[PDB]
Amino acid sequence: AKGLIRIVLDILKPHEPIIPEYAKYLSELRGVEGVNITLMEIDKETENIKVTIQGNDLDFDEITRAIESYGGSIHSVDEVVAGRTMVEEVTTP
Amino acid sequence: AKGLIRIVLDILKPHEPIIPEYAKYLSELRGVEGVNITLMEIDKETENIKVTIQGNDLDFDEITRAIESYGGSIHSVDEVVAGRTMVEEVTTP
Amino acid sequence: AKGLIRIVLDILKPHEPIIPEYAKYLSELRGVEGVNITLMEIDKETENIKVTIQGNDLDFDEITRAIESYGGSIHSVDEVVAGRTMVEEVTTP
Amino acid sequence: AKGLIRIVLDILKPHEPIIPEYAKYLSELRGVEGVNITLMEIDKETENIKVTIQGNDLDFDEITRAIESYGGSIHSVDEVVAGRTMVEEVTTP
Amino acid sequence: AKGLIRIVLDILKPHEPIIPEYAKYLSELRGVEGVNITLMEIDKETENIKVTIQGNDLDFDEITRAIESYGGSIHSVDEVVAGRTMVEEVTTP
Amino acid sequence: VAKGLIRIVLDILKPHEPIIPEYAKYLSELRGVEGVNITLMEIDKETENIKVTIQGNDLDFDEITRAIESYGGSIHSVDEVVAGRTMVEEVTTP
Amino acid sequence: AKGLIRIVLDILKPHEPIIPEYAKYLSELRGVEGVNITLMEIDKETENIKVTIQGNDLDFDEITRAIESYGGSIHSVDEVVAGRTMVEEVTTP
Amino acid sequence: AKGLIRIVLDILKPHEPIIPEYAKYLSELRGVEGVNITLMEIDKETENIKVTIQGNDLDFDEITRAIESYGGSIHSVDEVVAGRTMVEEVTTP
Amino acid sequence: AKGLIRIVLDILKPHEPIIPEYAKYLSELRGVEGVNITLMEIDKETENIKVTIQGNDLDFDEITRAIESYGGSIHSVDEVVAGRTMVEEVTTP
Amino acid sequence: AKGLIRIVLDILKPHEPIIPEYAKYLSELRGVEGVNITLMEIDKETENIKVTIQGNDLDFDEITRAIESYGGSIHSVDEVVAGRTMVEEVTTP
Amino acid sequence: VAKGLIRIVLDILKPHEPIIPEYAKYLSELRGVEGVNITLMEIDKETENIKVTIQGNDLDFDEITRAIESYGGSIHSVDEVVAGRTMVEEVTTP
Amino acid sequence: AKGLIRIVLDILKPHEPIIPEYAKYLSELRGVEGVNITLMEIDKETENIKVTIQGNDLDFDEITRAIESYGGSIHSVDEVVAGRTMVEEVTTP
Amino acid sequence: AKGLIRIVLDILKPHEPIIPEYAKYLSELRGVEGVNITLMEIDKETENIKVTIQGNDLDFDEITRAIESYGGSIHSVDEVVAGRTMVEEVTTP
Amino acid sequence: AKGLIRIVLDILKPHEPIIPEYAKYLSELRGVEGVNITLMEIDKETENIKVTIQGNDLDFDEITRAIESYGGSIHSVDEVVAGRTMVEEVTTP
Ligand SMILES: [Ca+2]
Ligand SMILES: [Ca+2]
Ligand SMILES: [Ca+2]
Ligand SMILES: [Ca+2]
Ligand SMILES: [Ca+2]
Ligand SMILES: [Ca+2]
Ligand SMILES: [Ca+2]
Ligand SMILES: [Ca+2]
Ligand SMILES: [Ca+2]
Ligand SMILES: [Ca+2]
Ligand SMILES: [Ca+2]
Ligand SMILES: [Ca+2]
Ligand SMILES: [Ca+2]
Ligand SMILES: [Ca+2]
Ligand SMILES: [Ca+2]
Ligand SMILES: [Ca+2]
Ligand SMILES: [Ca+2]
Ligand SMILES: [Ca+2]
Ligand SMILES: [Ca+2]
Ligand SMILES: [Ca+2]
Ligand SMILES: [Ca+2]
Ligand SMILES: [Ca+2]
Ligand SMILES: [Ca+2]
Ligand SMILES: [Ca+2]
Ligand SMILES: [Ca+2]
Ligand SMILES: [Ca+2]
Ligand SMILES: [Ca+2]
Ligand SMILES: [Ca+2]
């Protein structure tokens, strides 16, 4: 296990496609152990969701394009993890 | 485990059927490891519950329809997990 | 394991009988592994309690009848876990 | 693993006997695997402490009496677990 | 195990001896597994510390002899555990 | 066995570019770095504050400080360090 | 393991030497399994770190003479743990 | 003023009468300035409300007559103020 | 001022009419000093608002027949205030 | 405006007499501008409530006695304000 | 006396441009707007979420919704509205 | 107003004399408007209290001597307000 | 009073000039009732501060340039207020 | 009021002089409405206090020097207010 192993991003999203679509679909890409989508805010034209993605050697620009193939839009990359083992954020002042 | 593996959704519901009822019935569905339902807020007409359903390649359309047919009505999908392993949501400012 | 594996309900009850009785009893019902009763509040005349019951294929009606025959009533069913495996509640916005 | 396997009682005792006396004593009671006594609050005349007790088919009446024998006095019973397993309490709104 | 397995007490104490000593010292007492000492509040004359001390069957009075012996003063015993198994306080209203 | 620096957590200022999964891939492959983690602190218009949690074996704070800067980064403060045989977590207190 | 296995102290210090130094150099110390230094508060003059050090039969005096050598100043010993076992502080009212 | 100027009580109560009535009604009682009623928890059979009622010299029993009179049931009086001036509870350990 | 001076209810509602409508139209209502509508939760179907309405001798039935006219549905009456004076809820254990 | 102008005492009383009795009674005591009694906690045998009292050169011994006369019992004194002004307590680490 | 809409709180998506004190000045001078307040929610790379609290007399939600959009804004949701004679604040509850 | 207008200090003290005495007394000192004593904690042997004193040009030494002559010692001076006008503490990161 | 009345921005800042400089200086500009600078984070080359500025018809690009005239740098405009009267943010979900 | 009107700073200090001392002395300085000092953390050598000083056109250099000369040492300036009116900090994510 190497490279990007965990990606977390917040996207904006026309209400369609429905979000179990996105999950099902993001499963397929290059070595994805699994995806987590949680609903952030739920506005009227639109939808804020937090996508958590994790696997081996992940393809960033693949995800990033795969997502837009769905009329969905990355607002920001919240967190990235890379390397042999899965490091979490440590808190502090 | 593949495709959809855990689904979290909040549904509005008439007081009947009761909630254990739903729970029992949802244990049935195609590849359903198990179901949790906690009681959100219990207005006079009606009853908001939370639905936590996990399993292997769960069928979304199966579920929604199982709930409607039941009296329930789906307000949102709060969260989904799709893939080989359970990715929990990683939290961040 | 199948069906009703966890049941949590809040019931009003008179000071009688002493709570260890209801526990000591509801232990004995069909398919109950354990029972937990925590004290909620205690008013002059009466008494609120939460009642967690876990087991295999607990029959929802035995249980409730049991509590009634002891002189307390089910104000509400707060949570229910059903299926093969203990699904816990996933928290979300 | 049957009957009362955990009893938390809140009780008022005169200062004396000191708090690890009870601990000592109550441990030597039938079925009793263990005893925790934390100090709740302490007033001029008197001392409010909580008595968590764990074991196996515990005697509610021995205990009740045992505590009273040392000049203690049961203000209330705040928890009970009964059965083959320790069911902790599930929380909900 | 047997007797007291845990005793927690809050004590007042001059600045000296510095508290790593109290730790060391009490560690060497009869039947002591380990001893934790966190610093509560640091006053100008004195010092206020929590001593958690645990192990197999503890001599409460030895423990009280030893502390006083370094210029301690036992304000209160906050918690005591005894018996065969390490029961913790359970949370409750 | 591990020795030396084993985890480091630094806060840095960062030109929007390069994007952040750059850093993560990049840093990932340093000397004896089992894993890096970057969470995003604050995404200002001019710049962008981000937090790097780096972890490995006998780690070279100077290979790291230099690599970041190359990418145009800037260490503001180092917030945590764990050195030695075992991973020790911070304990809390009054 | 015996005597002190964990020591937590709050210290003040010049900006140099930078903190990953202080970390390196106490791994060096006698019987020190590892050290954790989180940054408490960074001022203009100076710089407040917390130092959590863990090992076997640690030497308080080596540790402390060493910190003064590095220019630092030990404000307080916030917690100490001693004996065979990592007793954590049990929290109470 | 004189006598009771404030009484707060928690009551259980069937769904009907809807609670704007209780408010209205109690407003018209002897010496009543105003009356606040917030909704605690909404159970299936019943309903749990807090009634804050205030004014000049209140007839406690009239207040208890009037509530019962609509199918109320007084679980407890939570707070009472009397005298010339409106003293509130002061916070303290 | 007399009878109800403040009423707070939680309601569910279609997205239309948009919420500044609902606001306008209850200012219209009889004896209504003003209304506050904050948005509780926005779903795909529907839309949960809280409605805080304040005035003199307000008419619960006008208010409520009016909300149903606008397509809405009143889930619960969360708080009511009645009499000459805006008694707020005094909070207690 | 001299001497004791506020006394908060925490006290255990048998259920009877009910709580607005004391309120009534204590108000008719010398110097006494007002009396708040909130309910602290309530057990099977007994009832713990807090008595905040406000006035002017208050008699500690009248009160102490007065409370005792009704079968009440002072567990402790939690606040005192004395002088020409009500000084509330300032908080600090 | 005031009538009609008197306070409105809306959340909008916003191209980084125009900058935010634009909006504030601009909106300030609408029909019967005693004051506007904009706090910044989240400053993403592509866009930017911001919150407008607008307040005045018999306010025209449609003059407002239109003005925002002109500046390239986009209402996502209206979060609060106060209409009528007096300013009523939300009361809280279980 | 000039000089020492507010003084807050935490002092240890024996159960004697009863706290209203220390208030009743410290009221009488030179330049004291009001005095507030809240109960901090109460141990078997002794007693912690916070002591807010407000006045004009309070002499710091009279006050302290006063408390000593009553048999409690000043553990620390938590806060002091000096000058013409009551400056309150401004909170900051 | 019209236009911008309140501006709040977070800037980055070489440690010089000192921050009482910035305050003193920002006072002068076109109609500034007053400025508030609080210290955010305090890094080693650098300094995060939150500037709050308030007056009549404020000159944005004046401030914005005035600030940089000091080797200081706007990272983001956090909040702006405009018009006849001073509107604060209202909170909500 | 003009120029500097309120200054908030945290300073490290030897135990002597005491803190009221400082307070008194700082009431003196050029145009000083009044001073607050609360006690932050009281390490063994030393004493972190917070300094809140407000007034009219306060002279910064005067102050720092008044504190140093006193034994104290300035770690940071946490906050300042300069202008015609006291702008408090307005808080935001
Ligand atoms: Ca974002
Ligand atoms: Ca930490
Ligand atoms: Ca409701
Ligand atoms: Ca929802
Ligand atoms: Ca994180
Ligand atoms: Ca009650
Ligand atoms: Ca979550
Ligand atoms: Ca007490
Ligand atoms: Ca739960
Ligand atoms: Ca102290
Ligand atoms: Ca519990
Ligand atoms: Ca930093
Ligand atoms: Ca701890
Ligand atoms: Ca505990
Ligand atoms: Ca319920
Ligand atoms: Ca208090
Ligand atoms: Ca209260
Ligand atoms: Ca109790
Ligand atoms: Ca304070
Ligand atoms: Ca929204
Ligand atoms: Ca309320
Ligand atoms: Ca104590
Ligand atoms: Ca502040
Ligand atoms: Ca920013
Ligand atoms: Ca609100
Ligand atoms: Ca310290
Ligand atoms: Ca500082
Ligand atoms: Ca704000």
TrEMBL record, chains F, K:
The keyword Metal-binding applies. One of its GO terms (molecular function) is metal ion binding. It comes from the Archaea. Pfam families: DUF211 (PF02680). The keyword Nucleus does not apply. InterPro entries: DUF211 (IPR003831), MTH889-like_dom_sf (IPR023129). Ca(2+) 1 binds at residues 11, 42, 44, 77, 79. Keywords: Calcium, Metal-binding. Ca(2+) 2 binds at residues 80, 90, 92. This is Conserved protein.
